[PDB]
Amino acid sequence: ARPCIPKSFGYSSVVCVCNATYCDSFDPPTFPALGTFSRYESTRSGRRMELSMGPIQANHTGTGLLLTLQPEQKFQKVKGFGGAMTDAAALNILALSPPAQNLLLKSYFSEEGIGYNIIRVPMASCDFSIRTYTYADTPDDFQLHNFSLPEEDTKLKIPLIHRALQLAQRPVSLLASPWTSPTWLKTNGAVNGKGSLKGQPGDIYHQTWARYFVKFLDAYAEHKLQFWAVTAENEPSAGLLSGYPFQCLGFTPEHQRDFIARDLGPTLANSTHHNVRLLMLDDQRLLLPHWAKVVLTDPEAAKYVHGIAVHWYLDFLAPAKATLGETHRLFPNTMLFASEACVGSKFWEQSVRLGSWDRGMQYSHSIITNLLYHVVGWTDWNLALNPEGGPNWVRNFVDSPIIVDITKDTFYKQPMFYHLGHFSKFIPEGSQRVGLVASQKNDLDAVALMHPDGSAVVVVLNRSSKDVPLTIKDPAVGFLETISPGYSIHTYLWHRQ
Amino acid sequence: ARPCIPKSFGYSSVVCVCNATYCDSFDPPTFPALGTFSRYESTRSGRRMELSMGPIQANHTGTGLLLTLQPEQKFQKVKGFGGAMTDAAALNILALSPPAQNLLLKSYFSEEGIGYNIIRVPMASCDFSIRTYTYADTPDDFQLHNFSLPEEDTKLKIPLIHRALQLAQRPVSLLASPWTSPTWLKTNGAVNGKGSLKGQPGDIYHQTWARYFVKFLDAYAEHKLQFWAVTAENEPSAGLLSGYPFQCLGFTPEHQRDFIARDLGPTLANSTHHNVRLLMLDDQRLLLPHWAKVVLTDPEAAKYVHGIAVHWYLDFLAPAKATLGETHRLFPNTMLFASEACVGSKFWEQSVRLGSWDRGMQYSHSIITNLLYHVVGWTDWNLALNPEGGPNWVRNFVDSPIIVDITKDTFYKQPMFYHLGHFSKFIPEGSQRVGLVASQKNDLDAVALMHPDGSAVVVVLNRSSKDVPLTIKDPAVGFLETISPGYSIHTYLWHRQ
Amino acid sequence: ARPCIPKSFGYSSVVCVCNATYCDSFDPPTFPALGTFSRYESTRSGRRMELSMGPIQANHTGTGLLLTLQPEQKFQKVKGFGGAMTDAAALNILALSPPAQNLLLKSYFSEEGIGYNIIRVPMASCDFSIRTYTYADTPDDFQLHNFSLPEEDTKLKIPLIHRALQLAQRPVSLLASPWTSPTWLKTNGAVNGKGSLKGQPGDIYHQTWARYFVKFLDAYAEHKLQFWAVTAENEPSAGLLSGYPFQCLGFTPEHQRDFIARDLGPTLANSTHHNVRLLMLDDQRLLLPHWAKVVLTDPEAAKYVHGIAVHWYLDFLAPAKATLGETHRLFPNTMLFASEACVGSKFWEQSVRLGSWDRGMQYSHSIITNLLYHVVGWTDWNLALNPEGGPNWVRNFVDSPIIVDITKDTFYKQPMFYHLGHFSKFIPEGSQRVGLVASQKNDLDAVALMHPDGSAVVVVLNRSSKDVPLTIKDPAVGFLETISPGYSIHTYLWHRQ
Amino acid sequence: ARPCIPKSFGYSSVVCVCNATYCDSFDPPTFPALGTFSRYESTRSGRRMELSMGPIQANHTGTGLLLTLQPEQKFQKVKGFGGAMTDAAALNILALSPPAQNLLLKSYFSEEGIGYNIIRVPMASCDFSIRTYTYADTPDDFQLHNFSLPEEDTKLKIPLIHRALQLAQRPVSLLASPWTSPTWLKTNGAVNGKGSLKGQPGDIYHQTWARYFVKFLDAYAEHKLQFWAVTAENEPSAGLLSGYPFQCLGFTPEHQRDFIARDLGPTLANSTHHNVRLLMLDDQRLLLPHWAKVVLTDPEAAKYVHGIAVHWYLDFLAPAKATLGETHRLFPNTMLFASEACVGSKFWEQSVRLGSWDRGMQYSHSIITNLLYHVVGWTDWNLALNPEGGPNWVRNFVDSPIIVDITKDTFYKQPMFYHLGHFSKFIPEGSQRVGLVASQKNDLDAVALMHPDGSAVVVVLNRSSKDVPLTIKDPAVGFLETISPGYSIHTYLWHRQ
Ligand SMILES: *[C@@H]1O[C@H](CO)[C@@H](O)[C@H](O)[C@H]1NC(C)=O
């Protein structure tokens, strides 16, 4: 149940060093006894998911901040938490010695780690690949007779995915996203740039691209991997832009609507993988609510869409209410999902920044707002990167929660990995968000959920320099008195009955 | 046969576009009667090994530079020319349809092409792989019972080498270099960075490593391939710098010496592959004379070393006289061989420049400098690359004589390909370098060689923009009046009897 | 007078080349008889503010889009148009030989130019300086006795502003904005990064800061310049980001309010420059409605606030209706102003793209959108930049309408310059925006407005590849049949009596 | 006399942190008493120029290492040590609060710092400028009527130069170098790329460029700065290379020869600044001895050259015997001077690496070798850089002994600053190098010199892990017993009489 081993790389906080024989970890999880709460803390100063336990008192006299649970107010059920098995992530992980590979995967996927239950798999290459390739690169192969998985799947991604699922006790859901199609299906003849599918929904190009999905699933299935969902297309808006630098395939909302309706919906249904769900959008949430309007108000497309997938860059800011909120209002039965998230780049920073507390707080802060607005799940980008933040074929640099230093056979767990963990570890699939009324204006972000077994979890992130005394109230049991240290993140759990 | 189909990409000269059905090629070559010479010409302006004939007549009306063949001054015999069959070149070649594959192979290995007769083979992965593996990654296998060939070998490298050999009429020698040992023989337990073999020459580790070389040979023999030679280590000096990003394995001059004396030599000699030869260094020529002084002034080491392998990459930090020149002088019975003849060069430039005359000239100039200073052979780097210069699992940095474009089922033959060919096609194994005296100081680079059958070849690179009028005298035959245009390279051929 | 000399730099359109002796310009504009309209046209293909005339005819042959002037619907009045006299632009301008200087200035401030009537003028350094500095760098001068103007002001900015004025027939309004205070009033003792004023609104730090605005206005008064307005701080949100690289100065909405009330308002009002107005925010529209909610609901703050200044950055992150639109509603007697208009975005793009029609469109599209959501004026960023998009002491990131090449004593007028001119030349101060109803869903952006003398002016923008037939109806006059070419921007003008 | 405040940034060693109120520094220097040695040490594990003192024993009993001072073998006299006041250095330092600026300058230039006596000054912009610009950009200004210093000289470079000279006891020597001429004197008409001086030496182009040097010198003189020496040109080999990215101006050796002979030499001689020495070359030592041969074997050129300037790239390796060795041999009376040194990225390998011992070692192992082969002086590149290695207008990336953090108003002294200091501080101007023979093969790099007053210094660097015990012998005085801890650098000082 070993503790963190800290190193400062000169920024606001430390990272935790793992290596072939040592990684920080958890005792197998356990519930506190009735009358008591558990609290996990992580701070800028260096505390990393330290377990302390406390009393639920029957009394409180104001008037510090009070957060009141409203066990009555239901909201979204919760799908899960996870990240992406990008080519680069696979590569960095396999470049470490076997035993360090497992401490790596346990960190993410074990119950002794942060219990991830989602993995996003790209369908052939993205920008975290070291070459551009699709699974059907033979020109005019409308039948897809030359469709095959390269080594990047059969040797890197796929094996790693089996390993991850073995380590994990929680069932894991796989999510696929393609970035680009073969270039012979694309008006512009290249993996990138402006350009969309050739022709017209309904036609041969469109039928082929949809069969391509079934092939992807067929091929993955002979390796004993099944998918929970696919998405219609990564960042479809990206491919509508002149000079776009990585792999992509443009869709306007109309094009996407028609593609799903006339092609991808039916092709999926007629195949043995009909159970696989489909998500639309997979893009920046500012395209909302309009993108959903367009697609979903067509019953032909709607019978086919299970949910809407969104992205955010965390250095930036959207309102949320106007997007996710409004979207929920209009389509309260099509689940919002965050399918990709990540931090820049500033530009004055510096893609990987080892031990940055800021980048930690943005993850949690964005996870909180997302849960506050009906989002059922949250997927990180690359599971691992190197210290340059690659490999990337096109030099697009971003950070990752785990950083691999192949030359030292070590890997660093970043603050990000831990703010992610405050949720991933304590909110299993099934959890239902429920209400949490603040007694008054405050700087804290907080959120409450209930496990499938009635029990309670609350996450509190504090982004001020100042400490904030506070009480959480729960009617069925009482008051919890605590502090949120400035620059802290806490998770509280307690039994209710 | 078929001529070069030119495409430009906005660099100084053009590439020859080949695809599945068309590729530029040569006729079986044909040598005229006494008094007549053949001349093959390539020019920045676009000419590509264009054949033409002329007279060698008895009066001499050149009044400019004279170059006189001096067959009685005889220097080194040529082992030959080739390139490397890295993981990355096998992927790129295998991503063309079969018919385009054979035109690529015919291009290099057939006598319709440029008649390569050497292939350098990595033993397990380097940075031109898509993943970091060795042939025995299973720890504590000091007898290497789990030693085996992955799919890179058994499914990409071996079948490509078989095909190269069916195509070549000339015998082809194979040369092998390791980049790294299993990580569990290394001081640092990492595929890269600073790290040597564990312990010291003699011990269980050095013996295991030495054995790995044999296991490798055994394995390839099962696939019916024999090596001409192996190198002691690819860039042993790299393995001594902290943070080196590529696969390496460190040896000081002194350590390499003892690994050869104590371990490598005795092991090979004691094996059924004792006939395979051993090349030392495999590194930058700036490391010479020294590295040779340390290894060869010890008779236990020297007795097993046949040759000294050099890389071109650096070189501008030398020049030839101090390094190759001096090494010959000191050890005139140890042959000098260019094992990694490469540069994608100048920091402000892309890895791949399609159609760059500068880089084609860089190749030829330095084959000329190398022949004038005793070198007996040239291995280019990667047979083929994608247009990024990859795949490389780390960073791209280098060009290749052939660029493959999978999306288009086409490949491009760079000026480089032809500057190699002006030598590789007309200097069969066994050819001997012979003297060639300039009547006056000139800006051209010229070498003369004599074939085994006695017939004469001269190559004249012109790296300036001005046409140089030129005569070549063969005392046996007469005078050859000609011109070397700006930015041209000529190969002359004639019978002497 | 003289037409445009086009030059291409391999982007979608041309620049107009201008030097010491030639530069493209206009005749005094010339209003025609009733029943006749003037149209000025620019197009991606090469037309630049080309004048043609036609009839407004009482019958309506048009059958496509109809746009109908509705003079009875009246909205905001227009303050005007301009850009910033940063250090970078004063330098680029003053490195042209005098005769070329005046044609650059005529180009912007003349009525044979585009009739700028606003200049924004930083108060000491920002990033578009060559070095950092304030007007009182000598610590503990709480009375600012050692306050003075450097050469950047007294030698470059000021004289260049005098000549923009001499040249302009329209009154020109000056707007001033600080980036940072003396670093001895800051929490962090640095010209940048995270950090605010020290202590509390009310205190000696806030008092001294407020005095600095006056001391500035004093300084410029002595050079006979007077300001229309000042902003409270350039991008105040920025100073709340750790390691923000440019000169900033942090204010929370709450802190800005308090500083306006206690210090900035009284001090200006209690001074001989009581007439100068104050603009709040000067920041990304994303911060609205909130920022004005916080400042303007306090009657002590609000009585001193004339206007809310917005930046165009940081615009994709928010729709206009949610921001500008929602803000007007809430505070419909506070004007909206665009104080910094900016493009050079798309990370994978060079900062300056010579002759890019796309960036031109981004300007006009966004002036249209602004105008439809109540904005009264615009200030572009830098008046001039070098081809690097510097001088900038931090990093170059942005384009400018006029790019200066010192080495050729020439400057280029970008597509941007004309898209701005399609507005700034024909919409004098005092012009009022009026309604314009599309007969049907379309792709054009259009805005209609009414000069003080009540003549009509209409801009139409076509961000599409295809020609759009168009009729424009003035109920008072008749119909204007016309076509809006793909990738074109039109300005129409007609008498209404 | 305050000690070092250490920060780790995660690499092999610490930096010393300075700020507005605190900087590590020395006491005024002290004569050690006869009988004793002084020893300054700096270590990988964190010691920074710690003083200790010790006994000179009269006896020793050998077998370990012994290095014997040969006070009689005299070698080169020493000119000095210093760095370059680039635009980027000037501005990073002027960005700090005024008192942090003095601690910075004191560290380099004060006698309680590391004793710099050289400042190299670029003549107009180089790559560590934020805009390209010469002192005469008015096209065809052959008379040089528009020649003037821009602010970068007047407000950044010059003021600091005064301030550094005021803080230094030792006379400081200024060294000027141009990178580029006005573009209208250059065949290609650009600040960069391939291209040299128009026409032929003797002509107006050539004669103007030389007058440009006197102009530079006149203008500098108006500001009371006199120059010790000027170089004919920075990296003249650079401007002969197609597409070279920063400011350059190519010369072949003959061009340089004839430029100096026909123009630069006489022009300078005819001027009031005839006292100013002139160094040729200013480029990679690879060009040796060939470049010296060409210039100096022409009497007309040679009467004008005072010394030869060399550059080294510290990531790489040149031999030196063959370059500097020979060059001395041929021209013992024209001094050798290193005008620029720097560590790039080792290209994998960020440009600033805070706390790198390696890069520290490369400085000293370099300085020692320069010292061993006749060099009189040694000048570092940029005095100060930001953490990104800039600002650079072109992104060329290198490290610096001092990294400035403008936002924290701090600065870091890197290991490099201290390997520099071990020489700069203790080898005043006029010191003479003398012999030092090792009793036996070792790894230590060492060197010994004699102060002008008679006294001794030796420096010993240890680049192995192992500690090496050793004795230094001086005949006149006795034996010094000591260790050289692995990864350490010592300097020893003793009076002799
Ligand atoms: C791995 O980590 C543990 C804990 O820091 C440490 O004691 C050990 O030295 C490390 N092993 C290696 C190979 O560095």
Ligand SMILES: *[C@@H]1O[C@H](CO)[C@@H](O)[C@H](O)[C@H]1NC(C)=O
């Ligand atoms: C290959 O190239 C030849 C000549 O350029 C051309 O005629 C033919 O169309 C090409 N083959 C294909 C399949 O494009």
Ligand SMILES: *[C@@H]1O[C@H](CO)[C@@H](O)[C@H](O)[C@H]1NC(C)=O
């Ligand atoms: C200025 O531009 C005009 C038109 O391009 C041209 O006729 C003239 O040569 C230019 N002037 C100079 C000094 O180059």
Ligand SMILES: *[C@@H]1O[C@H](CO)[C@@H](O)[C@H](O)[C@H]1NC(C)=O
């Ligand atoms: C800078 O100097 C010392 C060094 O540790 C420190 O105690 C002091 O507080 C620092 N000053 C600032 C402004 O941080």
